[PDB]
PDB file of C-alpha atoms in Angstrom:
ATOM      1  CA  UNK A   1     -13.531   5.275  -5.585  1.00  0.00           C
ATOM      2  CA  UNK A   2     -14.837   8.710  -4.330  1.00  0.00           C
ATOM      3  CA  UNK A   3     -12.557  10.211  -1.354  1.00  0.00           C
ATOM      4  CA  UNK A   4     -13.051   8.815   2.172  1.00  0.00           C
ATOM      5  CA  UNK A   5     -14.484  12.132   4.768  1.00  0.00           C
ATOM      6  CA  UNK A   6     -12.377  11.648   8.009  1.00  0.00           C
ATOM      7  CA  UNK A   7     -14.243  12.152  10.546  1.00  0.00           C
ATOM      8  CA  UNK A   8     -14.304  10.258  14.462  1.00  0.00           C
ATOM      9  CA  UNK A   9     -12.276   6.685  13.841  1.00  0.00           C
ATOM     10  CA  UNK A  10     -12.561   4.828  10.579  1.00  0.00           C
ATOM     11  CA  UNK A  11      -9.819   1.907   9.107  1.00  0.00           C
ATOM     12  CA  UNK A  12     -11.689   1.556   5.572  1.00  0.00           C
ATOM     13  CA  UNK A  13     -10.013   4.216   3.657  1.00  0.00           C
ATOM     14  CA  UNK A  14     -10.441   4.836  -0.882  1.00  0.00           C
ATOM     15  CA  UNK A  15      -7.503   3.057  -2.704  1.00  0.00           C
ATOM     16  CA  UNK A  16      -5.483   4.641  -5.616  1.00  0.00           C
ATOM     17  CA  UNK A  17      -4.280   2.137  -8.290  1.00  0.00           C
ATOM     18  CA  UNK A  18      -1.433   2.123 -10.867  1.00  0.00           C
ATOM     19  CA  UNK A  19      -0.707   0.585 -14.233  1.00  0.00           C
ATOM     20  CA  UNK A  20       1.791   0.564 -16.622  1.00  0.00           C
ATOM     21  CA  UNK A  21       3.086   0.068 -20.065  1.00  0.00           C
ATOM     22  CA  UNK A  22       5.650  -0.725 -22.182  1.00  0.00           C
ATOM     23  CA  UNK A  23       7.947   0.794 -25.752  1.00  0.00           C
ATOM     24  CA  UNK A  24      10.246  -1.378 -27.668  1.00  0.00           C
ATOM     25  CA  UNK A  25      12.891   0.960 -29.581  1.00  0.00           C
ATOM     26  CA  UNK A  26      15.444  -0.605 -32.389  1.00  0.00           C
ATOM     27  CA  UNK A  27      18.467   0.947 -33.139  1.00  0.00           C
ATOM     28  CA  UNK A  28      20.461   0.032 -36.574  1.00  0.00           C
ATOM     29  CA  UNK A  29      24.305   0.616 -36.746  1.00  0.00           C
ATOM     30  CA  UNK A  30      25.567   1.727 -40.535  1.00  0.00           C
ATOM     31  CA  UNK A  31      28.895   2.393 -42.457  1.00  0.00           C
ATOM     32  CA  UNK A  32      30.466   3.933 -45.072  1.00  0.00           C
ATOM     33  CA  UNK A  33      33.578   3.767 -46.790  1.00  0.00           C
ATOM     34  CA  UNK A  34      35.742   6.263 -48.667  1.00  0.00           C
ATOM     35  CA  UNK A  35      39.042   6.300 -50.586  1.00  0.00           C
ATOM     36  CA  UNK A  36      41.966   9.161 -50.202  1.00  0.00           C
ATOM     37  CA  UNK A  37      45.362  10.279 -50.122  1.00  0.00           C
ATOM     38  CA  UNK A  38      47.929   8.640 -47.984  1.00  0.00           C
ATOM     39  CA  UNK A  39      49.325  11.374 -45.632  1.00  0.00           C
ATOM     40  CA  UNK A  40      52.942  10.643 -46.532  1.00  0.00           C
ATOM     41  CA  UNK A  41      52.439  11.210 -50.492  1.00  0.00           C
ATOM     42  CA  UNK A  42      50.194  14.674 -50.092  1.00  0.00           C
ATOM     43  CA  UNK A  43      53.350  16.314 -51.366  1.00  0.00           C
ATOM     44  CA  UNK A  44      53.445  15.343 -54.656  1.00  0.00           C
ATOM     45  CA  UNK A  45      50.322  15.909 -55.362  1.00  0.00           C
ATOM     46  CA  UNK A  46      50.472  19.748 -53.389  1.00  0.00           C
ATOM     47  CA  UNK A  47      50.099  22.241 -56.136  1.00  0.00           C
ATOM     48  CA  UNK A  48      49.998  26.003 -55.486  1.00  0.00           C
ATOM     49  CA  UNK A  49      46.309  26.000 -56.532  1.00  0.00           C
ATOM     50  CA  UNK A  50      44.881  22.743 -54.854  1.00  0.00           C
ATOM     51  CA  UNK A  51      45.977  19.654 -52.678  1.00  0.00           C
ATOM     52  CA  UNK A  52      44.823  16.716 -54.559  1.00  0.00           C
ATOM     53  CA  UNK A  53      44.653  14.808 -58.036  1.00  0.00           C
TER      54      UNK A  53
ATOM     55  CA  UNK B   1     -30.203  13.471  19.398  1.00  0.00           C
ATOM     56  CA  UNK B   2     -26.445  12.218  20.426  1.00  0.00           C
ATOM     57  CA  UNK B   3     -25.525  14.499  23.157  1.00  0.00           C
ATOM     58  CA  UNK B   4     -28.074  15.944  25.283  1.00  0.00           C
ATOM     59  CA  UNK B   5     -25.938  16.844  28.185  1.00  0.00           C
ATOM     60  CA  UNK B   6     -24.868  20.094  26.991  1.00  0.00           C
ATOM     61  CA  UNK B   7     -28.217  21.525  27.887  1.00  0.00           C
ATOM     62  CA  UNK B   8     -27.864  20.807  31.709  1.00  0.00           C
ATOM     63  CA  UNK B   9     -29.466  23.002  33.993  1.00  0.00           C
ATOM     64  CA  UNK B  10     -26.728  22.363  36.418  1.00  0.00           C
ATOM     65  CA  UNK B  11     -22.973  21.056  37.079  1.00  0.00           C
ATOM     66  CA  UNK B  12     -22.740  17.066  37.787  1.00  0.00           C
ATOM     67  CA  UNK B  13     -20.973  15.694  41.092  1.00  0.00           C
ATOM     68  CA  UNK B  14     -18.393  13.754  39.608  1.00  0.00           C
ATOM     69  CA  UNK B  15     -17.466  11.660  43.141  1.00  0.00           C
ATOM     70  CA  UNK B  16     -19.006   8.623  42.724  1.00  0.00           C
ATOM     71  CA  UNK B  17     -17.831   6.234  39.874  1.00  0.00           C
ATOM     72  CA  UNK B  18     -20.456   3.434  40.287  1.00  0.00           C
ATOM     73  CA  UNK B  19     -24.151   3.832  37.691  1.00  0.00           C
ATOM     74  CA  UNK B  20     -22.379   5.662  35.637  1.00  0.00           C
ATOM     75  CA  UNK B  21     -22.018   4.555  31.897  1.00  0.00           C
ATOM     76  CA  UNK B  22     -25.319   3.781  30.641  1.00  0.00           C
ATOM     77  CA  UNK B  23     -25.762   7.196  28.723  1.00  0.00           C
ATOM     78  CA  UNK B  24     -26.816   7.912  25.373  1.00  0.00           C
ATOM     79  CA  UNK B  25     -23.972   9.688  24.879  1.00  0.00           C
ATOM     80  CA  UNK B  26     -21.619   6.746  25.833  1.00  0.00           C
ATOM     81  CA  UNK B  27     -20.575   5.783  21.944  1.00  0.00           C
ATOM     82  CA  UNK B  28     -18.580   3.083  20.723  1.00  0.00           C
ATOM     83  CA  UNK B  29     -18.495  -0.141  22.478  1.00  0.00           C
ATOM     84  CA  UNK B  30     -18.241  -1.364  26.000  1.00  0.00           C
ATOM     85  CA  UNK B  31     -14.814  -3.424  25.030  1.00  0.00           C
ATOM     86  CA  UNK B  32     -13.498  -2.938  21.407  1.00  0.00           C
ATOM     87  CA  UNK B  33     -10.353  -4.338  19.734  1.00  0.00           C
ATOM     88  CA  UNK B  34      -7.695  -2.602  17.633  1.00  0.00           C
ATOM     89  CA  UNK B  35      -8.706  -4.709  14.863  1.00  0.00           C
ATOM     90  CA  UNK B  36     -12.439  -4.033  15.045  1.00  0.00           C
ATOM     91  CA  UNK B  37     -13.348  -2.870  11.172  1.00  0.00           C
ATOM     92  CA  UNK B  38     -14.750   0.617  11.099  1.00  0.00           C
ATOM     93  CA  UNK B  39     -16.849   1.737   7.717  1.00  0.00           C
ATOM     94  CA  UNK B  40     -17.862   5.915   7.432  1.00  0.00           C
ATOM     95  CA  UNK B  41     -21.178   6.161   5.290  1.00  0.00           C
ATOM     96  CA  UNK B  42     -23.270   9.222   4.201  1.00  0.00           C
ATOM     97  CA  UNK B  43     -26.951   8.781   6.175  1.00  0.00           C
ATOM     98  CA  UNK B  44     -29.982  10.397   6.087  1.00  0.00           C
ATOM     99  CA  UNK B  45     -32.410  10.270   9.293  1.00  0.00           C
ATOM    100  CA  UNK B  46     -31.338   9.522  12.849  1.00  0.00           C
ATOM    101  CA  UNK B  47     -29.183   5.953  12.517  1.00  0.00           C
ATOM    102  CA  UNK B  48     -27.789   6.340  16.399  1.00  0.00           C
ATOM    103  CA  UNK B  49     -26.758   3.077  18.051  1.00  0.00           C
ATOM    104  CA  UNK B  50     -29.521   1.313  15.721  1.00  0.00           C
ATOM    105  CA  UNK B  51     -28.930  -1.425  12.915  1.00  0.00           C
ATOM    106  CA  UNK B  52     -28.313   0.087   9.538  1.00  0.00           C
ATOM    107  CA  UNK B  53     -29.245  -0.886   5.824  1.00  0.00           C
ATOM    108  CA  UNK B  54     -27.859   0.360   2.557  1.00  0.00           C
ATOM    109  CA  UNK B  55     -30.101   2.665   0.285  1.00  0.00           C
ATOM    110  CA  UNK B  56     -28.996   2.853  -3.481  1.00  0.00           C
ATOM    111  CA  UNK B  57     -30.896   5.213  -6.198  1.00  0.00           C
ATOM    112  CA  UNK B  58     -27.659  10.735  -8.546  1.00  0.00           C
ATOM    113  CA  UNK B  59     -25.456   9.862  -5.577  1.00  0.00           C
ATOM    114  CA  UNK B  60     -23.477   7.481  -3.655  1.00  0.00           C
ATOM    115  CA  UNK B  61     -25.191   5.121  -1.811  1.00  0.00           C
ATOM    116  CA  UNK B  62     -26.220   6.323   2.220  1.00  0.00           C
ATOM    117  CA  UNK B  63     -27.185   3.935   5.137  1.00  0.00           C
ATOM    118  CA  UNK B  64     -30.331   4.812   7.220  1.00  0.00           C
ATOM    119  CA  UNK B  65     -32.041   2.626  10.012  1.00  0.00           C
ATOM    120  CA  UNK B  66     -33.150  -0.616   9.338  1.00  0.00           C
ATOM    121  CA  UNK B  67     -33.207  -4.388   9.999  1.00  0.00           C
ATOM    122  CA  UNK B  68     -34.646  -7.642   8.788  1.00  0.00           C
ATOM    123  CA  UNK B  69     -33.173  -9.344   5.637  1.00  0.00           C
ATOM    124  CA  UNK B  70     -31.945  -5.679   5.050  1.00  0.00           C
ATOM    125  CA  UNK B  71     -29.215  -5.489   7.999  1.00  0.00           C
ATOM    126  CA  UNK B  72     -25.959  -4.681   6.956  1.00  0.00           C
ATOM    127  CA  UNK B  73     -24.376  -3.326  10.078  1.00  0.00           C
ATOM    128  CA  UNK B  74     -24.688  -1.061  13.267  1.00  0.00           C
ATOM    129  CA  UNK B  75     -23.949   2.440  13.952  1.00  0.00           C
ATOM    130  CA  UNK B  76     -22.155   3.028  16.850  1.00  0.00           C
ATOM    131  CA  UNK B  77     -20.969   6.946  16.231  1.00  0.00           C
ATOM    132  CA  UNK B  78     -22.031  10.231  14.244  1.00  0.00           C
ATOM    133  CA  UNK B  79     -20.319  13.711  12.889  1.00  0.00           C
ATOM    134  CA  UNK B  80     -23.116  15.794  12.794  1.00  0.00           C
ATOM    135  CA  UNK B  81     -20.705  18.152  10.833  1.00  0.00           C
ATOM    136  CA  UNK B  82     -20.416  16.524   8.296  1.00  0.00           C
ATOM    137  CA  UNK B  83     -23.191  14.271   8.379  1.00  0.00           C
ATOM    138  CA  UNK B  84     -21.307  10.665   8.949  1.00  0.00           C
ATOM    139  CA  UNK B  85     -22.008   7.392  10.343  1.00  0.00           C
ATOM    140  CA  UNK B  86     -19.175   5.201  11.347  1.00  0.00           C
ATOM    141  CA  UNK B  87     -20.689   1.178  10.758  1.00  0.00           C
ATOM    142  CA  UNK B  88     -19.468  -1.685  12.147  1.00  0.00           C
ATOM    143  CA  UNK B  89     -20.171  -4.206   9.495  1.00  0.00           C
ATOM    144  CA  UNK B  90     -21.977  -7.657  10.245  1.00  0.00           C
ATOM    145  CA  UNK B  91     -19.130  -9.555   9.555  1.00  0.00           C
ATOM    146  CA  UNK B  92     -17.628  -8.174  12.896  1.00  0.00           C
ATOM    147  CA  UNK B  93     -18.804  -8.751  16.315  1.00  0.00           C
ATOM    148  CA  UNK B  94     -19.782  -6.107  18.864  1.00  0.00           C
ATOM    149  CA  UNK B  95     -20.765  -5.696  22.067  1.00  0.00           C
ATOM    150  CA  UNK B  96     -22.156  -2.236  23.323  1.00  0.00           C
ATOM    151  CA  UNK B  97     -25.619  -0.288  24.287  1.00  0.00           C
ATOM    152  CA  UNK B  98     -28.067  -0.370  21.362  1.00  0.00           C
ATOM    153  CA  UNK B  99     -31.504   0.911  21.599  1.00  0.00           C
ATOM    154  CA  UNK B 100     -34.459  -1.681  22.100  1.00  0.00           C
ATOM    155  CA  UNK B 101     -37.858  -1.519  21.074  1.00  0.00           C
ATOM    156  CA  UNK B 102     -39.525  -1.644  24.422  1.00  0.00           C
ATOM    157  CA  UNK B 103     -38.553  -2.065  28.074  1.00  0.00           C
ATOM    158  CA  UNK B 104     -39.454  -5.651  28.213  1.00  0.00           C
ATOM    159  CA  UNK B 105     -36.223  -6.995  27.037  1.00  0.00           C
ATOM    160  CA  UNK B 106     -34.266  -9.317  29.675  1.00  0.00           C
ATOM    161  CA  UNK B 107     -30.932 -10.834  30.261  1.00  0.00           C
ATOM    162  CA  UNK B 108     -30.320 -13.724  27.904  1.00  0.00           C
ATOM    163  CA  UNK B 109     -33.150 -13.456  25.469  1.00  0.00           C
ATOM    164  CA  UNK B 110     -32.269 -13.193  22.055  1.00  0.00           C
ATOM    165  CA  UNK B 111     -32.863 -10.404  20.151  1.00  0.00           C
ATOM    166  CA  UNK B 112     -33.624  -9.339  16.266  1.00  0.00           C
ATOM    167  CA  UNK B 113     -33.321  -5.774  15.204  1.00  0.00           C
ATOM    168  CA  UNK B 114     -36.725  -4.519  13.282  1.00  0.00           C
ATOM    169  CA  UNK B 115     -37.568  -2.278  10.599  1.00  0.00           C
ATOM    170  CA  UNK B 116     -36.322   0.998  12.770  1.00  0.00           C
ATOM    171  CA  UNK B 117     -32.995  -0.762  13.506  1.00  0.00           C
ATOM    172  CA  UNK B 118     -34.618  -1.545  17.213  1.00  0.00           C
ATOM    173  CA  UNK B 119     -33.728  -4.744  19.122  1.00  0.00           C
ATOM    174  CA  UNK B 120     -36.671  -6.562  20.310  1.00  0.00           C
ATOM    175  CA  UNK B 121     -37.460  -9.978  21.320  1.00  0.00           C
ATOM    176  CA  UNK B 122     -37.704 -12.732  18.990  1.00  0.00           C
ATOM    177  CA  UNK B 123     -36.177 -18.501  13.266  1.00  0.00           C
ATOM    178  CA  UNK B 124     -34.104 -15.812  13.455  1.00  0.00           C
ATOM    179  CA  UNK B 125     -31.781 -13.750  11.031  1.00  0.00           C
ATOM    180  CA  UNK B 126     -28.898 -12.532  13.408  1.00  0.00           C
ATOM    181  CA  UNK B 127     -27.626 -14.149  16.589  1.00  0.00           C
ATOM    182  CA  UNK B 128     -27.265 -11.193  18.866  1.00  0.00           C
ATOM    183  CA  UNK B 129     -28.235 -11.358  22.862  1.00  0.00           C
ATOM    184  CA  UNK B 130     -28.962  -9.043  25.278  1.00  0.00           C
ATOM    185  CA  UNK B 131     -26.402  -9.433  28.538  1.00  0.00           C
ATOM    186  CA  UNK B 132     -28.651  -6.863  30.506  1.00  0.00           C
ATOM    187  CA  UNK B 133     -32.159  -5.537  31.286  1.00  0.00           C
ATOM    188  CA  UNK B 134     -33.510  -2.996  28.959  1.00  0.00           C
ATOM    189  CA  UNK B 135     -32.402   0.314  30.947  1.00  0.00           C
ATOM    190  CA  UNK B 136     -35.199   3.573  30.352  1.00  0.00           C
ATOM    191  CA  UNK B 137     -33.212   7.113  29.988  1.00  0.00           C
ATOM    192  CA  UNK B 138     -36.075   9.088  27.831  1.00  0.00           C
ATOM    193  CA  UNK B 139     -39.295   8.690  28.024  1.00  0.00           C
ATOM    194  CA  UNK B 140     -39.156   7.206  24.730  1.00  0.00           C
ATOM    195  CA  UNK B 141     -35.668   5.484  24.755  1.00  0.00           C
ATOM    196  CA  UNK B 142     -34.052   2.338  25.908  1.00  0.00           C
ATOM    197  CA  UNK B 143     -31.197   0.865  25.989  1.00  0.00           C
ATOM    198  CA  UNK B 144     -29.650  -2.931  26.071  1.00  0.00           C
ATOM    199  CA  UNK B 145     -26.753  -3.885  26.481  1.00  0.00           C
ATOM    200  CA  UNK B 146     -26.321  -6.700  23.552  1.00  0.00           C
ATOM    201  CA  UNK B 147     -23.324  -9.271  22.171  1.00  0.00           C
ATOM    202  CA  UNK B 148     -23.788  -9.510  18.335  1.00  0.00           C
ATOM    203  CA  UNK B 149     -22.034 -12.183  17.415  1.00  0.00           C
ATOM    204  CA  UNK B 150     -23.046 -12.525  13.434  1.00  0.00           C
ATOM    205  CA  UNK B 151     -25.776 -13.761  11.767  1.00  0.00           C
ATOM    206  CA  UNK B 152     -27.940 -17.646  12.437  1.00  0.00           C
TER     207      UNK B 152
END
């Protein structure tokens, strides 16, 4: 409603009202999987030029 | 208009405390409770201690002096600032000064508020009743004291 003048006595006063509302998110877990070197057997495969095979 | 004591001519003598309440100026009401309901409205005219209507139409609806079928409560104080009238509404009882018609209003007689929010002498549409003699201060106004007590 409009806003209430105060002025002498008055007890019937303009209300303020509220609302609300709601969001719904999803969230998906994924995974991926690779192949590689044991750490132990790097060394033979260490060349001066490259770690790997 | 409300307070026409602030043209005196001369200081009051303040000793005796006896005839001393029925006044224009004396707003409100004779007893009132905390939980009396109290409504502010816009007005346009002179609504002073008289029974009050709503007037809708571009603006908010305003209250001015009336009675009848129309009644929808009684003015009991005004902010001339700003133009206010603070409403008792029917739903709530009062008891207080309220002007009357004419001076031929006595105690007990009921009494229905007219087109210019007067109480006169009477069905009916409101039960209100006048608990004194209709007291002259202008030459023009009375006053009665009156228990409204809701509507027949």
């Amino acid at each position: 409603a409009n806003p209430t003048t105060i002025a002498n006595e008055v007890n019937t006063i303009s209300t303020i009202g509220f609302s609300s509302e709601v969001v719904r998110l999803n969230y998906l877990k994924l995974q991926y999987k690779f192949r590689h070197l044991k750490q132990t057997s790097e060394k033979f495969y260490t060349s001066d030029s490259y770690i790997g095979d | 208009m409300k307070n026409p004591q602030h043209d005196a001519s001369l200081l009051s003598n303040s000793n005796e405390f006896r005839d001393k309440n029925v006044e224009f100026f004396a707003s409100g009401g004779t007893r009132t409770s905390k939980f009396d309901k109290l409504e502010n409205h816009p007005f346009l005219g002179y609504p002073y201690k008289r029974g009050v209507k709503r007037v809708i139409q571009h603006y908010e609806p305003h209250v001015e002096a009336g009675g009848g079928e129309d009644l929808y409560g009684i003015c009991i104080d005004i902010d001339e600032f700003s133009k206010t009238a603070t409403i008792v509404p029917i739903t709530n009882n009062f008891e207080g000064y309220l002007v009357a018609k004419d001076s031929t209003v006595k105690v007990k007689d009921k009494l229905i508020f007219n087109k210019d929010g007067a109480l006169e002498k009477v069905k009916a549409t409101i039960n209100a009743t006048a608990l004194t003699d209709a007291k002259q201060i202008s030459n023009e106004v009375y006053l009665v004291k009156v228990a409204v007590f809701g509507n027949k």
